[PDB]
Each structure stands twice: as structure tokens, then as C-alpha cells.
UniProtKB/Swiss-Prot annotation, chains A, B:
Has antigenic properties. Elicits a specific immune response in systemic candidiasis human patients undergoing malignant hematological disorders. It comes from Candida albicans (strain SC5314 / ATCC MYA-2876). Keywords: Cytoplasm, Gluconeogenesis, Glycolysis, Isomerase. Disulfide bonds: none annotated. This is Glucose-6-phosphate isomerase. Belongs to the GPI family. The gene is PGI1. Homodimer. The lineage of its organism: Eukaryota, Fungi, Dikarya, Ascomycota, Saccharomycotina.
Amino acid sequence: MASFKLATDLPEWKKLEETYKSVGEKFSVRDAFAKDPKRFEEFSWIYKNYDDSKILFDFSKNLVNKEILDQLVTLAKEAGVEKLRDAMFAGDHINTTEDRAVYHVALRNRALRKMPVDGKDTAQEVDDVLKHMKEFSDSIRDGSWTGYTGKSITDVVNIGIGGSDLGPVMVTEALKAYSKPGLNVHFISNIDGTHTAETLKNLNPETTLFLIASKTFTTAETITNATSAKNWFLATAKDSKHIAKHFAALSTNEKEVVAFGIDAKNMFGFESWVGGRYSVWSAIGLSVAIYIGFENFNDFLKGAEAMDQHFLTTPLENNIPVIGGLLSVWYNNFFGAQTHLVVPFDQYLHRFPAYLQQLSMESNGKSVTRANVFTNYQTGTILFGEPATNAQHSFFQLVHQGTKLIPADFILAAQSHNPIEKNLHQRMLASNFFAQSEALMVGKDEAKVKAEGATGGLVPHKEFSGNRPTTSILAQKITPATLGSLIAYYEHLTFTEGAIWNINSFDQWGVELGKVLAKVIGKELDDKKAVATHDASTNGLINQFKEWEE
Amino acid sequence: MASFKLATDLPEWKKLEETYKSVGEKFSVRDAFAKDPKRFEEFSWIYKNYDDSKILFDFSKNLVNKEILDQLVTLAKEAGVEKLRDAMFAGDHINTTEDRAVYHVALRNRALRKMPVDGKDTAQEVDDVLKHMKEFSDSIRDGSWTGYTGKSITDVVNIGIGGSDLGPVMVTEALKAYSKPGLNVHFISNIDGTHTAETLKNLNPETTLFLIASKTFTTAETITNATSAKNWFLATAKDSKHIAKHFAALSTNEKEVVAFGIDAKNMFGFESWVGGRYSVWSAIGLSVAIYIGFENFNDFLKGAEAMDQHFLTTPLENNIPVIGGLLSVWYNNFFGAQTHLVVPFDQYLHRFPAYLQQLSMESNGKSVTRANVFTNYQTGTILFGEPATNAQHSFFQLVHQGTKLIPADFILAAQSHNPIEKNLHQRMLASNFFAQSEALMVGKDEAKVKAEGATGGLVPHKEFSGNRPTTSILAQKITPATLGSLIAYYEHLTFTEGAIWNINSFDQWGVELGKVLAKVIGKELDDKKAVATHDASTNGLINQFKEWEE
Ligand SMILES: O=C(O)[C@@H](O)[C@H](O)[C@H](O)COP(=O)(O)O
Ligand SMILES: O=C(O)[C@@H](O)[C@H](O)[C@H](O)COP(=O)(O)O
Ligand SMILES: Cn1ncc(Br)c1N
Ligand SMILES: Cn1ncc(Br)c1N
């Protein structure tokens, strides 16, 4: 049970409202730097990873100073962020509405600390699944695991949706530099038959391995897609005895895995306390281990574990994911910015914003607190993003000159995996990272536009307000370990936000309802008779579809 | 000049504020359907394309009724939407800040109507470039255009960024069903060297054609990328005279094309009055014509032309793109919703939201009106989206149960290009389309949550408010002509928004700024000497990068 009902009940909340009115609303980052020559030192933090590599988190272009951050930290204290965090790490059932522990942190427990759920250590059970993933992925990669005609596997197809899809997609893309030629990964997720048809169109059943990724192993899209893949496989292989060399499952539900026809030896398990949007660290990440090797996947886990330890052991005022969470609350609830922008200056990370979009919005898009009362304040923001430099040529127009405050995270690796032309492209990429955040902060006033040649009515169109905030995250290199730490950072930033808003960041009753909505209409689409069982729009859409379908 | 200064100066603006307070804020869509037995008929419109195919635009689940819509139409008349539109179609220089015509509508003038810029018809000049595009794309597809060793082309790589990239990407993905095996398209855009390295990895210089796509032919990323591709080509081909069989240009700047070493005969031209984010209809679309054939590209243009004629000739109250734009203004400026969601129930259109994100935000992310004064109201919204059904398992949680109003457009084709398993996947896909908009409207109240078995504090967590608005767009099938009409619909929706806000939807001074920002820091990255020429954050980021760079 909760220690308070609403975030607006916390005494520091109304003090932050007063601080917003007096100094927040018209905050000048320019004046902040002029006042405080040590500003960069004071509002940037270096994170040291377990492998001694480093990530610089620079928050100093944000609309924040010592007064504001001190108040936000007091708010996090009043909200019991530390109490809820420690309960999470203790394995307590802090997912109250499903009565579950929340224990993705136990998935990356490579140190084998005691991490118990229901009083029983999980360390060895998690480690045993990882040992199975290492053995299997090693045998795929070295060719000893052969298909039903005795050939080595060349293509691995993950079939799953949502939390069982986007992690694998984003991480295999982000770590693609660590893959091997001739071993490729693919992803079927959408129920839209296009996804099945286009993915399988040029694959060979004799050299294709399927991972059916599903926590429940009952999701309509996934089971239907898995059935279509099994039918495609059997069209060439004929005998169901051969499925055991070509189909594995990533799941919590062994009974449904076996009933679908997958051997239990080919099941890689996890537990109910792994949320789908927190699941890439589990058996769900098997496609990652196959694509880049288990050791790289293990280094990915160890990066998350090192960020977990930072989150667990650091006083709030120097706790990097807490600081990031506090700034989001500041913008969302006091400035009323509804969105947050994430821009990787990194092409490999092109699906990173989409992954954070699920993690953030599915966690914190809630309207009821842990006191089981409705909120009267904003919760989760809308997250969006695309890679730079592309984004600089498109919606950055609105980030620079529109009428909406859009807090933004920019991410750059100091070193490229592809340093072509003696780093000519990389230096250009980095120069854009620095110059864009600079320009959003400094802007361009009326006098400078005039000095640059504009006259008359053109002048205001070319002005830039400045004081548009960014966080810059500079890594040395986007290694597996660095990516692990970066995702965990955003996991714990999300945790911090949710704790302040007093919501359950770990259920998803809107996604759960969606999984049961479509069946009734699906039955109505089986016969061609007109329908009048819904509202007039739903009827009209269905009936127009029936007239236009095949 | 402008006929008014600010949108808040239009008399209907204050009336819409009164209507928002009295009818809008607490609008019940459930009540609306109960009150109006003809609501679906009254708030849905069937668009008929030039080829007699049809698209149903169903707005009836929006927070709108006859009174509200009639006031929005009156606002559109006061704003002179029609006068600005007619000026656009007449070739007038309505891009005031750059003193340019805005004539993407002339690109798809396949009827060869008289469409003059500066008093001179553009019809034959546009048609001549399309004739060149047909000739060249025909020769690529039939194998008669051969590489420098006499082989037919198997791979086409577009090199460009922003408006010279995203349309070609999105449309080739969207119309992929119309491609043929053995002729593939690829896209280099990011300056990040990863994009060059990974795209050229498996390609053969002997059979690869490059299209250098740049309106100006001076953009730093694109010319740098184009130089790298030329270096890659020449590392195998050795002789620069081979460039003429492997490099073409899509540009307005012939002198810079020729200076780069591309034969003028290999240039596909267009004019200054084609904005990048409106350019896929021009020579910029050459990759589309190559990938799917010129006649399909031409049908795509003809679908846009038909939607143009709808927009041009239809009174406002039945004008489909106008209605879409008026609703956006209603949500943005009276409900205060900062975002707009676009969800294609269609895997081929997975890049459609990203394309609209550029179209929308780069057009309408502006703070100054055509009277050259700053706005005192919100302008362009933040657009985002992913295809369904994937979106239903992730950020739809927030759409259903968060604290933010998120107006949403759902798009579905009644017929799939891949109707596998006797349309089993397609019927499931369709059922989710109907069920999701239905659930967002009807919700689930406390009594039903209790009837479904929840008790005590769990109940509020499983409630859904309903009255969350959607627009449903149902096409017969996403053909080239359908996609052409769909993009043009959103172009003219964006038009209508910007005309009411009285902004210039067709310049982009923040994008123009971005392309001149990085050079100063780029020259400082030629050294590893520490820099102190900027603010302390920019200095600190640059100096930390120098310490960590390779
Ligand atoms: O976030 C979620 O809970 C969803 O996206 C699930 O991951 C998705 O519905 C698939 O569920 P499952 O893994 O049980 O097949
Ligand atoms: O919308 C825009 O204007 C930009 O995205 C441009 O398309 C981009 O900067 C590329 O410019 P160009 O076509 O001149 O190379
Ligand atoms: C506010 N925010 N930004 C990134 C992420 Br993940 C969240 N929750
Ligand atoms: C508001 N809106 N929705 C889609 C697009 Br393109 C715009 N401008």
C-alpha cells in the first residue's frame, strides 16, 4: 500500500509550482551560465561502467539550477522513490494490480547476488536459462546445430509482438556491428499477412530457425504467425518430426509451448515478474545472443547490472537516472510539455526512440495511483524521435521555431564502429551533435538577424528563441555494455517518474484489453451478412469493409 | 499581403472558445450517436479517385457535431483558406519569406491543365522531366542500361537527406508489392559513416546505380556521402569515365551537378517551387519509378491530382482535407492537445507516420504569421506513430488510459496485397482496426469493471474513460493511386491548418539554419586541442569528445 495518495499531496509539489512561477517559466539558460562559471561541472555527471568505459550525462542546457534541482530531489524523497526502488530490488510485489514482483533487475544479476522472489533466490534459475542460451546460440553460430537436411542455420526468425519483438529488433540493429556475415536475423510481428509473406519470401526452410517469443504463449497475432510459419516450414519439410530442429520458444508457459508442438528441450523460460517491455534481458533476447554471440549479450547484461548498482547505491542528488526522471516531471507537470524527444546521432540506434517509446508510454500512461484514486495531474509524456542528422532536416524545424516546449535527449558515441575515410564522416556527425544543442540554447535574436542581412517583415521569421532545453549523452563507443547501461538508465528514469506520480509503472490494462477486443468482430467478419450490433460508426466501417473486401 | 494578423483576430475564434467551454470540453461521443441517428452518414465522406476506386473518411468518432463543424467552417472562411488555396494553384508566390511559388500540385498535373509560374505554363516543362524519368527507368528495368562492364543494373542507391530521402523511402516501402525480384532500392542519407558502410557492404559496383538527390546539390551530408560513394565506385572501376553509367542527379542546380562530375544528360531536373517535403512527386521520385515502374509512379501522381481537384473544387463543408485540418485546429488550439497520432493498420506503410511527421511538423512548426508578427497561440502539432497491430501492444496503453488527449488517424485497406491463408490474417487485422476505435470511443465504466469481476481497489485501474477520438480511413486497397490520394490529403490538411494559423507552411528557416551550424565546430574538430570558444556546456562536450575520440 502507498504512503500517499496523489503527487499533488506532496508538500514540495506546490512549492515547485511557486518556483515555476517565479524563476522556472522564463528561465534563461544563457543567464544561468553567465552566473555560474562551474555550471557544466555542476550539472554533468560521468558514469563509469563495469569495464571502466564511460558515459557523460550533460544536463546543463536544461531549464534547471541548484534551487530547482534541490527541490525536485526533495520531491523524490517525499514520494518515497528510494523506498519503492528498494522494494523492487527486494523482489516485493510492487506490481500491485497483477500482484507480481518487478524483477527485470534479476535478469542481469551476473554477479549472482541473492535476489529473491517469494523468499527464494532467483540467481541460479536465471543463470541456468542463460547457460542454456549460451549453449544453444553457440551451437547455432558454430554450425553444430543443423537443420533437418543437415545444413547449418543461416537465418533466424523471431516471431512475437510488442515486448516480445521490439527489444530484439532494436538491439540487433544497434549492435549490428558485432554480427557475423552469413548469419542473419529477421522479425515477424504484425498480424498483417504482409509481414509473414515478405519475411519468408526468400528464406530456405532447411536453413531457417524460428524463435516463437511470447510470455503467455497465447497472443493471437503471435500464435497465428507461428502457425503460418509452421505451415510454411512443413510445405517443404513435410514431416512434423523435423519441427524439433527448426522451432524454439521463449516463454513462461511450458504447457502451451508443448501443446503447440515445440519440444520442451527447445524452450527458454522466464517468469511472470519479467514485463514484456523489460524483457530483452531474459530468454526473449535469444535472437540477440545468436546474432552477436552470447559473450556480447552477456556484456550487454553486465552493462545493465552496473547501471542498476549505480541506481541502487547513489544518493538521489547524484543519481543519474533519478536526475533524468526529475527533469521530465519538471517539464511534464510544471511547464506542461506533453512530449519528450530522443535523438540518437547514430544510425545503428535508429530503432532506439521506438523502443523507449514503448518502455516510457506503456509504463507511465496511467491515470490511477497506488492509492487506487484517479490522478488530477499529468502522468506519462508522449515520446518520439528519429536519428540525426536526418531529423535536423525534418521535424527539427518545429523543435527550433514552433510553439511547443520539447525536452530532448541527444546521444552520440565518440568512436564509430565504421570510422570510414579516417573519421571524416564521424567528425561531421559529432559537429552536428554539438552545434544543434548549442543553437537550441543560444538562439538568434532580432539584432543578429538584422546584422545578417534581413530587413523588414522577414526579420522575425528568421529569429530563434533559444532557451530550448537539451540533455546531451556522450558515450565513448556504443558497445554492448554501453547499450546495456543506456537502456537501464531509461528504465530507471521511467521508474523515477512513475514513483513521483505514484502510478504502477508495471501493468498495462490497455494492452491487456486490446488482446481481447477483436474476437467478437472477427467472428462477424466470417459471414458476409451486414452487422448492426455496434455503434453506427463501427457498423458503418464494418459494412463498408464487407462490401469492399475480397 | 495578409488579410489578417493573428488567428485570434478572427471573430469566429472567440466563438469557438465559447463553444469549447459549453459543449466541447466534456463532449460525449456516445451521447452524440444517441442524439443523431444519421451521425455516421453525416460525418463520413466517400472520396472517389480518378480510377473509380474509393476511400471512406469516417470522422464520426471525433469530438465534433454539426454546430462545432459549422463554426470551424466559418473560421476557415474568415481565415481565407480558399483565397490562399486558389493563390497556390494560380502559381502565386505564397512562400513569402523565400519569395517562391508553392507548386507541388503542378508536379502531378497529368491532365496538362495550364498551371503557370511567373506567367509561364509549367505543364510541358514538368511533363518533359517525367518523360525523361520514364525513358530512363524503363531502360534500367529492361536491362538495356548497362554498367561499365556491360551488366544490367540490380541495385539502385538513392543518396540524399530529409525531403530528398524520406519520400523515396516511404513510398518504395509502401508500394513494395509492385516491385520485381532482382531489382532492389537502397537509401544512404545520414552523414554517420555507418549508413554508407552498411549500405554498400554487399553491393557490386558493376551493377549498382546511384541517384544523387539534392535540390541545392550543396547539402553537406549528401555531397559528402556522394563523394564517398564515388570513391567506393572508383576503387573498383578505376576510371572516372565509367561514372556516366552509374551516377545520376535529381536536382535544381545543373552547374553544381556538372561540377560534381555527373553528365548533364543524367540530370533529372525540378524547380525552386518544389519544397523538399513535397518533392516525392518530382524527379526526386525517380527511385520509385525505377523500383515499381513508371506507369505505377504515374498512377501515384494521378491519385494526387484527383485529390488536388477535390480540394480545389469542393465547398469547404464537404472538403475532406479541410475537415481533417479543422479538427486538428480544434484539438490543438481549443483542447490543448499537443500531439497527433497516425497509425496505419498496414505493414507496408510502416514509414508513413515518419513521412507525415516531416510533412506536418516542418510545415507548421512556426511562430510568425504572414503579417510578420509572432503568434499568441499554438501552431503545428507533434506527429508520431507506428503501424498496427504492433502499436496496440505498446504505446496504445497511454492512448487508452493516460492523461493526454491524443487525436488519432487509423488507416486500413479492405484488400491486402498478401491475402495469405484465404485472408485469415487480413480479417484479424481488420477486426483490430474496428475494435480499437470502438473501444477508444465506448470505454468501460466502473459498473462494467465490477461486473467483469474486479473488486476493491483494483476497479479504477481497469476502467477506460471512452470518448477518446479517432478518425478512421478505409481504403479499398493501397494501390499507387490510393497512396497518391492519401499523401495529397495530408498535404492539403497541413495546408488548411497553416492557413488558419496564418503561418507560412512552406519555408523552413530552422532547417536552413541547421545546414550552416556545424561547420564552425567541424573546423575545431580538426584538432584535439581543447576549445573554449563556446558556452561551457558546448566547450565541455567538445573537449570530452576530443579526449575520447579515436
Ligand atoms: O508490453 C506488453 O505486455 C505487450 O507488448 C506484450 O509483450 C505483447 O502483447 C506480447 O505478449 P506475449 O509476450 O505474452 O505474447
Ligand atoms: O525539407 C527540407 O528542406 C530538407 O529536409 C531538405 O530536403 C534537405 O536539407 C536536403 O536538401 P537538398 O535537397 O537541397 O539536398
Ligand atoms: C521521459 N522519458 N524519456 C525517455 C524515457 Br524511456 C522516458 N520515460
Ligand atoms: C495534424 N496533422 N495530421 C497529419 C498531418 Br500531415 C497533420 N499536419
